[PDB]
Design a protein that fits this description.
about 675 residues; 4 domains; eight-stranded mixed β-sheet; seven-stranded mixed β-sheet; 19 helices; about 30% helix; binds calcium ion; DNA-binding
DNA sequence: GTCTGCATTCCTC
DNA sequence: GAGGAATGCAGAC
């Protein structure tokens, strides 16, 4: 037998890896259960002709945030031991268990989000940091999803990433010798017959089968060079699709990307560099100090890097002296030593970022801007980072005492301090009338950070955490309603730190799905789980569940708000629909009505038998929930004790159905004890 | 209170 | 209208 571990943000992320494996592997025998209270498992027996294989995948939902807050040891430390100095966390880490320790096989990130401008590089930090470790990095992104107007939930123009984003993964792969790739899965809203923007998209770009093949080959310890080349070719084909759809006068053409790809030129020595300039777009509301003046100086000497409006460009060594002179004149820089450092004879990449929102809170997308530059032109390139967003007084005080202290606590400052050779600030200060100008020669500091690795030591995560939280409530709820209770369906599942999944409803042999679910609802709140049961009542049951660590965490009227959220989505035509036999997704045509279903709400939480009959009555009064699911762990022997408390006779019929049908041929129901 | 994970919306060319 | 810039949220530290 071979044992693998799937460390994920939550149970849903872990299960997505299993679903990829299961899509290509047709197992003979499948067993599910728990190895510990927090860790579910899937044990499969499959064959490749005459060759049988026995694998077990132990899932570890919830990564550590500090060092030993959830698990006894952090699996992410194995990445920091190999050079991953950014605390960017992937969605999943797959490990192999050999000689009493774990060994990373790959890191996976799932992104459904709209690739709208800077959202495309928001998570480039994890690709950069994990990519420089030698462990493979796979970025799976849904192509395509539409943006909605929210006023009436109608569709707006499709959003595509800049061609340089998919390309950065290919260039980081070449520079490091590692496998870092962007893979595209067919989204439900990919409807080329209806949208002219997709007329020239090659459907061979989709990588569902190749991602499954790659994972299985890695698990089997086989040569993945061929699969890697197929995946790199699809990433290159996406660069072709995107670059051939943009105006060539301000963006790189496919011929330019191809010449960099085949090794004819490097991105900074392209013979055509300069045909377009770097022209950073700054909103009027973001302007302050001498920022507009600095931007004019950059546009006087810059050459465009990939796109004229990307937040970075190049100042060639031939123009560096004049650019530095102009910056010195603008900001009154007169120190001879500083000027000599700035005038080094090499090409300089200038990156201009706001960095901070009006309240001083850091911009999440900006954390990936320097990693994007480093992935395209190599981390060794000289980077001049200009910041103009508002700083909290505490941040500017740390900049003047120890910039590394600020980088230690904040991820945006960590991105800036790790990859910038020069850090220039022209920032407003919260509580002050005018801007602060700073020029930090960060060259030696950057060099030291690029060679930093944490203590070398083996890691084997103990399957029992420090304590059981909301993620464990979600794992238990997911296991019960998705694997144990029959004729069930998981339309919605949003555990702590989860993706924007969407809601699926099955009715009359069709599956209807709402995508791009907004968090803001006038009368409702998005449920953490929506379970559909069709063989209990004449009308299908939709059970909306909100999970918390404690019963007191259930907000007032949460039960009513969950129902109102479902009613809110029913007021709009589903985004997509498909037949259960056909399987081909189409745009939604017919509307769904709430009275065609029985809507119930439930609150799930951990309680160590501290709730009396009157306490349950008070929770029902506060929340308005139709059902309360009190969960408690028993340590000796390990078991999850479940107590179902119904408010009304409809919920009581559901409870009796769960009790009678708490039996499975796949899931080990022996790990649970249902009190009632 | 702030982390950093998750996003959709705003604004300039 | 194209496409980056700019904005906020949440559970557990
Ligand atoms: Ca995540
Ligand atoms: Ca994700
Ligand atoms: Ca929740």
């Amino acid at each position: 037998m071979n044992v693998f571990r799937i460390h994920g943000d939550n149970i849903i992320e872990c299960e997505r890896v299993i679903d990829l494996i299961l899509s290509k592997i047709n197992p003979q025998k499948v067993k599910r259960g728990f190895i510990s209270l927090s860790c579910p498992f899937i044990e499969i027996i499959f064959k490749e002709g005459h060759d049988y294989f026995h694998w077990r995948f132990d899932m570890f939902p919830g990564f550590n945030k500090n060092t030993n807050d959830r698990w006894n040891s952090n699996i992410l430390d194995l990445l920091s031991q190999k050079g991953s100095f950014l605390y960017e966390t992937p969605d999943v880490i797959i490990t192999s268990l050999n000689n009493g320790k774990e060994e990373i096989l790959m890191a996976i990130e799932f992104c459904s989000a709209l690739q709208a401008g800077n959202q495309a590089w928001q998570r480039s930090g994890r690709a950069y940091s994990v990519g420089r470790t030698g462990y493979p990095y796979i970025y799976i992104v849904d192509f395509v999803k539409y943006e909605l107007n929210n006023s009436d939930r109608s569709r707006k123009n499709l959003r595509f990433p800049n061609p340089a984003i998919p390309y950065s993964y290919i260039s980081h792969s070449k520079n490091t010798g590692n496998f870092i790739v962007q893979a595209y899965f067919r989204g439900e809203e990919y409807q080329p017959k209806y949208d002219k923007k997709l007329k020239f998209f090659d459907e061979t770009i989709f990588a569902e089968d190749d991602i499954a093949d790659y994972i299985i080959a890695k698990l089997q310890h086989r040569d993945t060079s061929n699969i890697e080349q197929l995946l790199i070719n699809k990433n290159l084909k996406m660069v072709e699709f995107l670059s051939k759809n943009t105006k060539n006068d301000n963006n790189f053409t496919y011929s330019e990307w191809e010449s960099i790809y085949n090794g004819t030129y490097r991105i900074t020595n392209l013979p055509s560099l300069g045909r377009f300039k770097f022209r950073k777009k700054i909103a009027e509301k973001s302007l302050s100090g001498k920022v507009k003046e600095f931007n004019n100086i950059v546009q006087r000497y810059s050459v465009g890097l990939a796109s004229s409006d990307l937040p970075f460009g190049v100042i060639r060594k031939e123009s560096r002296n004049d650019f530095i002179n102009d910056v010195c004149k603008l900001y009154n820089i007169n120190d001879m030593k500083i000027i000599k450092e700035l005038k080094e004879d090499a090409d300089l990449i200038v990156c201009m970022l706001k960095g901070f929102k009006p309240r001083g809170d850091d911009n999440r997308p900006d954390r990936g801007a320097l990693p994007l530059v480093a992935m395209l032109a190599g981390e060794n390139a000289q980077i001049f980072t200009f910041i103009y967003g508002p700083l909290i007084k505490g941040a500017i005080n740390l900049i003047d005492q120890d910039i590394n202290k600020l980088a230690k606590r904040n991820g945006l400052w960590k991105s800036f301090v790790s990859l910038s050779d020069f850090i220039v600030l022209d920032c407003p200060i919260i509580g002050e009338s005018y801007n602060e100008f700073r020029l930090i020669i960060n060259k030696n500091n950057k060099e030291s950070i690029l060679r930093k690795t944490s203590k070398q030591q083996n890691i084997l995560v103990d399957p029992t955490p420090n304590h059981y939280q909301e993620n464990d409530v979600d794992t238990v709820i997911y296991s019960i309603f998705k694997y144990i209770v029959p004729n069930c369906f998981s339309g919605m599942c949003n555990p702590p730190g989860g993706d924007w999944s969407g809601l699926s409803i099955i009715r009359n042999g069709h599956e209807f799905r709402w995508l791009s679910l907004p968090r803001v609802s006038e009368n409702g709140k998005r449920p953490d789980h929506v379970i559909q049961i069709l063989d209990l009542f004449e009308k299908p049951l939709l059970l909306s569940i909100e999970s918390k660590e404690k019963p007191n965490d259930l907000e007032p009227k949460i039960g009513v708000q969950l129902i109102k959220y479902i009613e809110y989505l029913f007021d709009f035509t589903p985004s997509v629909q498909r037949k259960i036999a056909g399987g081909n997704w189409e745009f939604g045509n017919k509307s769904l009505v709430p009275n065609d279903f029985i809507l119930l709400s439930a609150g799930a939480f951990i309680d160590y038998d501290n709730l009396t009959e009157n306490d349950y009555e008070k929770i029902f009064e506060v929340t308005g929930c139709d059902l309360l699911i009190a969960i408690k762990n028993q340590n000796n022997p390990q078991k999850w004790v479940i107590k179902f408390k119904p408010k009304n006779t409809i919920a009581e019929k559901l409870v009796n159905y769960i009790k009678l049908n708490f039996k499975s041929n796949i899931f080990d129901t022996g790990f649970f004890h249902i009190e009632g």
